[PDB]
Amino acid sequence: TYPSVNDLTLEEKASLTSGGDAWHLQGVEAKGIPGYMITDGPHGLRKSSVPATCFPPAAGLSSSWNPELIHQVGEAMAEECIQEKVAVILGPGVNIKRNPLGGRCFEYWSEDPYLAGHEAVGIVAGVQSKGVGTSLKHFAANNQETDRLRVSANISQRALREIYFPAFEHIVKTAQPWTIMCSYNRINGVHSAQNRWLLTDVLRDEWGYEGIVMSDWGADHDRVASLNAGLNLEMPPSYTDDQIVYAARDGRIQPEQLDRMAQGMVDLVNKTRSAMSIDDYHFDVDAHDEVAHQAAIESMVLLKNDDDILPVAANAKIAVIGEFARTPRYQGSSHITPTKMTSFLDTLAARGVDVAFAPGFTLDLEPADRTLEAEAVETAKNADVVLMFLGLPEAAESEGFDRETLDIPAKQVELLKAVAAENKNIVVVLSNGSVVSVAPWAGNAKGILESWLLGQAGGPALADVIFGKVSPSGKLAQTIPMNINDDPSMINWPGEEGHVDYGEGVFVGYRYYDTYDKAVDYPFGFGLSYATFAIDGVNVAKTGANTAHVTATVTNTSDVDAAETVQVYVAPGKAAVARPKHELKGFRKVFLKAGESAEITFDLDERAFAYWSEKFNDWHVEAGEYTVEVGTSSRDIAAVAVVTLDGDGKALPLDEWSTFGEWADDPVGSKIVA
Template sequence: MTASQSAPSHTSALDDTVAQLTREEKASLTSGADFWHTQAIERVGIPSLMMTDGPHGLRKQEGAGDALGLGASVPSTCFPPAVGIGSAFDPDLTARVGAAIAHEAIVQDVSVVLGPGINIKRSPLCGRNFEYYSEDPLVAGVVGAGFIRGLQAEGVGGCVKHFAANNQETDRMRVSADIDERPLREIYLRAFQQVIELSHPWTVMCSYNRINGVYSSENPWLLTTVLRDEWGFDGLVMSDWGAVDNRVAGLPAGLDLEMPSSGGASPALIVAAVERGEIAESALDAAARRAVQLTRRAAERPAAGGEIDVDAHHALAREAAGRSIVLLKNEGDLLPLDPKDAAASFAVIGAFAKHPCYQGAGSSLINPTRLDTAWDAISEAAAGTVTYAPGFVLAGADSANGDPDTLREEAVAAAGTADVAIVFAGLPAAAESEGYDRTDIDLPADQLAVIEAVAAANPRTVVVLSNGGVVLLPFRGAVPAIVEGWLLGQAGGSATADVLF
């Protein structure tokens, strides 16, 4: 019996605990105690549990909580986001990453990590595509199940999100995803079904949006008929933060826990609804029982404390990042480069080489324990001469105040005297985030101009991309080698050098 499953002997104990609770106490368990914690009832031994954002690292905030990554968080390992590690097609690798994140959660006294994101990449414009594994439901489900398996094997709960059909960020709190049942089941729900059946997650998070006109947080077909009755999910369903529209409708539909705290307002509404017969007492009992069950599962976790093995986790992040990289083009076997050739010269071009874009913005924003750059890693690995030119303006980088024409000319000069030019290009950090979608799939015009000019100056040009979503490659016929570097986490710079060489 794994920690992610309920033993039959626990059933009567859970029921006995719920039977000792007053109606008000049961209702209190259906709402958070604050931004990150569940409600405690000490007199019957129900502790408060802490949850934090994931999914590619631990985002435990130091002060007051917020959902969009504005508050500072404790340092933790930033592993490759799902857009990268999903391209490794290896659930065992994601299990190892999940286990490492679980160890960091234990150190920080976190019981549930909010991840992974399983939503399908329906549109290339979705601003949060970097948090999702794939366009393919089988890949997303199998890889996501690996993450849950690794996380929960260490005693930390996972939370599969965002259930379901949350495939755009623009107007996500009001939009209705209108989908016929067959594609809904075969595409949008299939990945979630894979994760539920393969890895038995402790919790599921419902999404902000409506599905066929009904909010996910109050959708009985979604949360009860499909999730519990058909797939056999036996854990707790929580809301995304602020995703509840009607709490009284949501409870009997299958929403057990509203997050964050409503300040007592929602529990009071639930109690009143039970008293007037609008909600059956049995529905409240079921939600309270699942809340108690979650605390019992979390109680098997190792005690909080200890230290993070920063070096080992950074090494795993580097391995995972290297496995995430995809070779798109390699004419004439230009790659791999020879790091031992002392006579070789390499021009490293592009501000991303020194200022990597390694994760997206929003609630998954990790404060990394360290950060490798491709410039440092290439300089260290290559026996030959390595030069650098920023090439284009990048906010927050050393080129921020540079003239675009001058920067491009410097890049061309560097490329023209090198044996190989390596251009680092991609999407700026502000382009990809929770909360809004992209408006196009183009790389910035100044970067495209640099690539075109460098390729004209040096026929041995490699382009390394940093992007969490689809981008057009109008230069694909002008360069012999293209490497898709996605968003690779804190060790992506070293991993890129590993792959290039």
């Protein structure tokens, strides 16, 4: 069907393998192939500073554990693309947060592969449900900014298969992103743009990826090598398509390979053609801002709430302290000019809530201002509750850099200590793109709300949660450690001499903490609410040789309507390989009014019990007992049940060098035992 690569000359085929400019696909308009615009936006359209809805960055939205809501954010993002003639929006990013100091953590979802895949899929399915393409971003293992253009992430196969791949694998198999962006870095000596094993063997031959692969901007170093590896599109164009033409003529590129790569670029245009032919579409600004309002509400995690200081009685004498309340930090250039943004101060003002405001500190690296500090003390001294807004200024999360500390600015801690001496009823609201330490100063706050980055609608969302219009329901998508030196990756971070060795293997984040009995400040999947919940009726049943099914009831046992996120972990027995004590294998968020109960189920397929075996070169379910844990946190388990699986029966060629235990576990060798 016209057009295809059969309708193109060699020069036209090769031109399709690199964009028209830094923001457009290659246009062959003479043969009906328009060069549609490609632009950023993991949390909203970022064209070019064109007003768009700034949704909460993923570091916040990952607190929702709500794929349906994330799917809804994607639909709004696509409709804005349809207005602005944008065929592909460059997101979402699903790289594992190996270390919380990673500079791009604000744009990623979790430290856990299952959570990242089952959350971020909402962006892909949502956007493309409107006919607009996405770009599953930085494939793969782009977990740091330090030396990102050169460093080789040296990773074992197990860690690649179990940690850094599954989020990519799930989104490719469940949805089907029309575009994938490879990472700048090398993996075991090979740049991703040039890695045929990554882009072809794994992505396409094993997983069935049907879409296109593009490079990150500048990531294509060898035009011919990248094309042969499976990279369809060089971005931005270096104006070197002549190298594809020459190589296609002298046998360095098989004609089938160029046809496959270029035809994919034609298919992308055809997949996005309908949405780009819609004339004079204008998206509902207020409707999209309300999606951002709801997305912002579910991006907050309540960490502590002594004496139920939250919610605030709304008629109370409020002292608002912290420049973040007047000059909000709500995103991560990645700047999106919001359609509308109202700060927390203007939100309380527009709602009739009368407060006393004191900046307290500045959002710069300048030393502490004793004058501003004293004013903030005089405020809150005359107040029922003090809402203090702390966190990281933009320069503490400078673009292109990894953090060197988890701490919030020291002068903000000093102000909190000084305020606490005159008023103990303090609620601290945190603004930060990635994990900040909490325990060193938590003693000065009765309530701690971790609001991450909320997007353009953070103001109204904060008022609704803090004043009890809605209960917070966020669960940590990231572990909050007692100290960065507890992280098993810190020893190999950020690397040296062009390489960083992922020596921790599969033991990343809570996978390490929960296995070696290490204290953390707040565990993965933790979060408080204004309501109380109870889990009972938990029943786990085997449904096959190596599958099980989970059934449980969750009940709102309070007088407050709120949501609870039930979490399922699999705790395997002693295995032939090292494994974390448990791993997240399912979750369900349920909105329940006061007194209501709900029955929820979880399917646990063979992959819920399987590790990657480098001996089998494949997933392997080992025979034995597996503990299914049901709870509301990785360290809040309500009920457990043991299932016994048969094993997947995979056998090994046996030789003299093997051990009797390798035959005892082999189906062919099990008969030789007796």
